[PDB]
Ligand binder design. Structure first.
Ligand SMILES: CC(=O)N[C@@H]1[C@@H](O)[C@H](O[C@@H]2O[C@H](CO)[C@@H](O[C@@H]3O[C@H](CO)[C@@H](O)[C@H](O)[C@H]3NC(C)=O)[C@H](O)[C@H]2NC(C)=O)[C@@H](CO)O[C@H]1O
Length: 159
């Protein structure tokens, strides 16, 4: 059970999606800390909603889409379509992220941590949140310390 829509999720809805992501990525070798660091980012990017377009502007593939706001959305949608995966889909977006770690895509090593190091890390959810922000997401505004608060929130409130 996941929420997938072009709408901002409430805290209760985010919690359903966040637990799902943690279970999925744990089976693929990620630590809870690394997952929560990423979740703290996804909350700011999309309210952890695989269906969400930047500005709620549905169909604008030049802008952000999905959990992490792939920008341009075509960076992800092109891949899903080429891979025969439905683009508007939780698992499809998690598969992209796994694909990125395996092929060293998306990540720029600005904090002397590689993507492969990140996913195995037991640094705090706040620190990993800030690393994922700087290395993977890289939005026009880099000052979003709330992503670390959010990471810790998910670390505390999920299993
Ligand atoms: C208005 C705004 O902030 N929009 C946000 C997007 O900027 C942000 O997506 C990220 O955008 C940056 C800058 O375009 C991307 O980094 C660039 O990536 C290319 C590789 O294709 C590289 O050549 C550049 O060096 C690099 N620039 C910088 C400054 O790092 C980055 O890949 C985008 N991130 C993702 C996940 O696609 C998204 C996500 O934070 O949010 C929009 O709101």
């Amino acid at each position: 059970m996941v929420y997938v829509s072009n709408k901002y999720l409430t805290m209760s809805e985010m919690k359903v999606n966040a637990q799902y992501i943690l279970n999925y990525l744990s089976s693929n070798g990620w630590t809870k800390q690394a997952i929560c660091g990423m979740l703290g980012n996804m909350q700011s990017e999309s309210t952890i909603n695989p269906g969400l377009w930047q500005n709620l502007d549905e169909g604008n593939t030049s802008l952000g889409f999905g959990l992490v706001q792939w920008t341009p959305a075509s960076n992800y949608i092109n891949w899903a379509n080429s891979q025969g995966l439905p683009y508007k889909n939780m698992d499809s977006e998690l598969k992209r992220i796994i694909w990125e770690v395996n092929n060293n895509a998306q990540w720029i090593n600005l904090r002397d941590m590689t993507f492969k190091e990140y996913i195995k890390s037991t640094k705090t959810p706040r620190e990993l949140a800030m690393i994922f922000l700087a290395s993977y997401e890289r939005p026009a505004n880099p000052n979003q310390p709330e992503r670390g608060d959010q990471a810790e929130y998910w670390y505390k409130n999920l299993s």
